[PDB]
Design a protein around this ligand. Structure first.
Ligand SMILES: *[C@@H]1O[C@H](CO)[C@@H](O[C@@H]2O[C@H](CO)[C@@H](O[C@@H]3O[C@H](CO)[C@@H](O)[C@H](O)[C@@H]3O)[C@H](O)[C@H]2NC(C)=O)[C@H](O)[C@H]1NC(C)=O
Lengths: 211, 212, 196, 216, 219
């Protein structure tokens, strides 16, 4: 087999700038290479074939280069919709192999998250389990610290986090942290609080409710 | 215009059989190279099998002897017969138009194949009540397998909809939340309903979310 | 009384593209096969149903020598019961093939800096070739329901593709000259025998 | 002319791996496929598989598919036959045979490689006289070579001088896993008092040399 | 998949006479329009690797003498030795090579058919050195006989022995075409000293009546 290595593993640039993506192979493939763009939730789209030729319907700003075992994908005048994972695939010899991809996100101005906390529903509380949700809505950058404090005690090990993909228009992120407790454990405490630490906040923001 | 639509994905126990279908329009199936390419959840792409324009077939080493690729000219359909399925075969399987066994110029939206011994379970939908720009949502918990689709007031509410990716709990079930951003003026004057659909378990739940 | 012209085939300065493979009809001559199997320049000498060492004492009505150039990775496709782009669309051997497949690396001869693109192979064909069938058509391959009218485009592919032979490529990518020997006994008077 | 040279004899315990080799030389070797043939003690020939060294084109017999691996090294004209785990039933002689092309007869054969798989350990023989008894002018005497492992054992009489009338029987494998053997000689009956007869037993694997005198 | 069956299993042909070995194929062994039966005959002398004699069922290989001829077509094939010589003692195999997997015949054992020769029978009591080790072995020798078929039975105090004896036979001598056989009776020291008479009873075609060689323990 032939192993394709892509660098960087991830990349982060603002709109209007130029992106340079790399792809190296175990052996020379002599232009038998292609590039694909896979946006979240969608199938890969062919961009470059033959390491130089653009597919139909592809803007000229996408450019492929290189030969042998050195290959480069150049993307100029970036736009917010260009966030995707980019793969390189070789067809020089069988079996055909892909790279591990390059995650490319779109930068923007730093945005402060809007923090909301949801107490568990009464219908859920009758089933023996409780879930407390903290919402971080429309923020950038993605890095943010979420700490669960119950009666001012830092709670760990019973929460899971999910973060959405970059928005297509404003390139913002959204994050949810779900604290899961049994009904008996939920009623052992009074104040449930969510503390959010982010670059766009002067001081951490705390949203809390009393059971 | 070219269309590739996959079907036949779903939950299947290890060692079982599953047959995938790919309807194609805009080109002659019997005159083109066609391939199946699969992508494990959160990982990269892997080529599975190819059928040449002349009917010759080839397979990846990891699936040879278990998978069979075929085509039906009259039905304009590409088939992938999967037997002796393993846990590592869990992936999104893509139908792809192949240019001379070189590169994949057209792709279908894909079908999800989950290989697991776990049983199907419908989700439980709970509201996320707002409190006095407001926010509210619905909690979709304890379902298996993927996926779950969430909509608000049928398809009326689309702006501000954030459906987070599902997390796999330590119990082996998936949980998901969908939230919206709405002004405080509406309160209960405007009615908000979240529509949750889980096709593997045939679960259809509409949940009213009103402030308390 | 006259030597069979094997030297014209094996030592030819130029070899044909695999889609348009050459064939040399050998008849009414005495063949000395020892100059072939005792050689050291061959990397592949695969014979099916007959021994080269036993060819110098056999008679055939006709002998056919086919020559072409392919990649190193595709040499294994020149064999009975094989499958692939070369075996299905360019050159096909029968399942009961009785003859020899001879190949040797020719990177020095058939490869040049910057790429030798003179050697072609057929990429698209609706059906597999019959054994020992030559298809030299260059008509635009119609991959859809719309007639192509002889112009390449969407669903209209040129049937032939060029090898990118470069001397610095890997062994599998390097050009290989292939000669296939076919031995035919038509129950007619035999005219291709070994030395007596 | 192509010649095939095989590796030396192998003595292995059950469960151990083994890889034997067959290296070919000579003109027209580029045309040669290397096949493997198994012959268990006293039985017929069994075709195991064949390989073309140039491209490692390997074809296995269905009776041996998955039991053995056949490979080749085209840089040294050597073909291999290996087991992942040896069983006692693998005890046999393994020939490598060359054929000029496939679907052709095997015209060149190696000398063969003896493979013995047994749980027994190396043990030196015990040599016992077979004393003559009283005639008709013909006397028979011999030596009993018992409880040794592995093969082979060389037996000679009077340091190789006595050859006429000597019958050294093939070894028999005992239920203990050890080999036993006898060698006998025909001598004139009148020479028992005068002549002295000594059998010379040498067992190289255990480094044993026994000179035993056979007297009436 | 193609099964090759040889007839007979063992063959005895006198010097200079004709040896005939037949091979039957379960299917045709053709390969292509060459119209050649892909059949081969091999010779394996005692202790030697197999040697190819005839290929394509009739074409003898280089160096093979003229007395070796192969015939037959379809599914029936025959190997014939015209002038039988002592050098020709071997096992002869037929092999098909039309397609993989190749299959051999079971093999045909060929020996010189000489005139009947009676064996000379000798019996050897266990040595006193071996008795000190706790085991007793008694050896009965049959020397220079033909045919190879012979019945050797051990009687201990006129009681037939079973399971405690092993026989070994030499290959056929290249000069007189005879065989030699050894039968070894193995007993424990305790079992050996509970009996007096140890007899070896030999029955052969060249003997008018069975020959018995016996001894008494320590007498
Ligand atoms: C294609 O041309 C090559 C030369 O590049 C020919 O190979 C040559 O063939 C001749 C016989 O015609 C060989 O001569 C012989 O050499 C040996 C010593 O190796 C000697 O004992 C003999 O008396 C005789 O002179 C010559 O060695 C050989 N050269 C090489 C480099 O292999 C080849 O025959 C031509 N092809 C055909 C099909 O004729």
């Amino acid at each position: 087999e032939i192993v394709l290595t892509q660098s960087p593993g991830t990349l982060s640039l603002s709109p209007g700038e130029r992106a340079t993506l790399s792809c190296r192979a175990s052996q020379s493939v002599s232009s038998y290479l292609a590039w694909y763009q896979q946006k979240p939730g969608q199938a890969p789209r062919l961009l470059i074939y033959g390491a130089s030729s653009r597919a139909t319907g592809i803007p000229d700003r996408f450019s492929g280069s290189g030969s042998g075992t050195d290959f480069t994908l150049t993307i100029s005048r970036l736009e917010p919709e260009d966030f995707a994972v980019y793969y390189c695939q070789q067809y020089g010899s069988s079996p055909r192999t892909f790279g591990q991809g390059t995650k490319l996100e779109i930068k923007r101005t730093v945005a402060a998250p809007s923090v909301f906390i949801f107490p568990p529903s009464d219908e859920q509380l009758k089933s023996g389990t409780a879930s407390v949700v903290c919402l971080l809505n429309n923020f950038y950058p993605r890095e943010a610290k979420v700490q669960w404090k119950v009666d001012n005690a830092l709670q760990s090990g019973n929460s899971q986090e999910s973060v959405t993909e970059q928005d297509s228009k404003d390139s913002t992120y959204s994050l949810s942290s779900t604290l899961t407790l049994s009904k008996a454990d939920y009623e052992k405490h009074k104040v449930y609080a969510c503390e959010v630490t982010h670059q766009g906040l002067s001081s951490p923001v705390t949203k809390s409710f009393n059971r | 215009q070219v269309q590739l639509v996959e079907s036949g994905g779903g939950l299947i126990q290890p060692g079982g059989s599953l047959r995938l279908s790919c309807a194609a329009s805009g080109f002659t199936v019997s005159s083109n190279y066609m391939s199946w390419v699969r992508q494990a959840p959160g990982k990269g792409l892997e080529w599975v099998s190819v059928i040449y324009s002349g009917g010759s077939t080839f397979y990846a080493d990891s699936v040879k002897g278990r998978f069979t690729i075929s085509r039906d000219n009259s039905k304009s359909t590409l088939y992938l017969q999967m037997n002796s399925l393993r846990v590592e075969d869990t992936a999104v399987y893509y139908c792809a138009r192949d240019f001379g066994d070189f590169y994949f110029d057209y792709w279908g939206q894909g079908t999800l194949v989950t290989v697991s011994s776990a049983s199907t379970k419908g989700p439980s939908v709970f509201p996320l009540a707002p409190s006095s720009t407001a926010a509210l949502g619905c909690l979709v918990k304890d379902y298996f397998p993927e996926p779950v689709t969430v909509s608000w007031n049928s398809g009326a509410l689309t702006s501000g909809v954030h459906t987070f990716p599902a997390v796999l709990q330590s119990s082996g079930l998936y949980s998901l939340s969908s939230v919206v951003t709405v002004p405080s003026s509406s309160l209960g004057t405007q009615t908000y309903i979240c529509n949750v659909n889980h096709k593997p378990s045939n679960t259809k739940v509409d949940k009213k979310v009103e402030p308390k | 009384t006259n030597l069979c012209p094997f030297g014209e085939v094996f030592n030819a300065t130029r070899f044909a593209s695999v889609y348009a493979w050459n064939r040399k009809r050998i008849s009414n001559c005495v063949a000395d096969y020892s100059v072939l199997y005792n050689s050291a320049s061959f990397s592949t000498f695969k014979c099916y149903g007959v021994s080269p060492t036993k060819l110098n004492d056999l008679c055939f009505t006709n002998v056919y020598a086919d020559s072409f150039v392919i990649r190193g990775d595709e040499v294994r496709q020149i064999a009975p019961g094989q499958t692939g782009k070369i075996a299905d669309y360019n050159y096909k051997l029968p399942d009961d093939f009785t003859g020899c497949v001879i190949a040797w690396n020719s990177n020095n001869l058939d490869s040049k800096v910057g790429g030798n693109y003179n050697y072609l192979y057929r990429l698209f064909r609706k059906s597999n070739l019959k054994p020992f069938e030559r298809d030299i058509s260059t008509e635009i391959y119609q991959a859809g329901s719309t007639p192509c009218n002889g112009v390449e485009g969407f669903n209209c592919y040129f049937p032939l593709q060029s090898y990118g032979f470069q001397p610095t490529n890997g062994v599998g990518y390097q050009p290989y000259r292939v000669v296939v020997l076919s031995f035919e006994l038509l129950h007619a008077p035999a005219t291709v025998c070994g030395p007596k | 002319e192509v010649q095939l040279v095989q590796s030396g004899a192998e003595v292995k315990k059950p469960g151990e791996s083994l890889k034997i080799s067959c290296k070919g030389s000579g003109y027209s070797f580029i045309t040669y496929w290397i096949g493997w043939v198994r012959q268990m003690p006293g039985k017929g020939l069994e075709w195991m598989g064949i390989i073309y060294p140039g491209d490692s084109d390997t074809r296995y017999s269905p009776s041996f598919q998955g039991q053995v691996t056949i490979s080749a090294d085209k840089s040294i004209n050597t073909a291999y036959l290996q087991w992942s785990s040896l069983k006692a039933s693998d005890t046999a002689m393994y020939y490598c045979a060359g054929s000029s092309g496939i679907s052709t007869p095997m015209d060149v054969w190696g000398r063969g490689t003896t493979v013995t798989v047994s749980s027994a350990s190396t043990k030196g023989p015990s040599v016992f006289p077979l004393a003559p008894s009283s005639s008709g002018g013909t006397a028979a005497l011999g030596c009993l070579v018992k409880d040794y492992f592995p093969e082979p054992v060389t037996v000679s009489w009077n340091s190789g001088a006595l050859t006429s009338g000597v019958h050294t029987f093939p070894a028999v494998l005992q239920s203990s896993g050890l080999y036993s053997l006898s060698s006998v000689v025909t001598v004139p009956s009148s020479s028992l008092g005068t002549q002295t007869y000594i059998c010379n037993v040498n067992h190289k694997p255990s480094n044993t040399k026994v000179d035993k005198k056979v007297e009436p």
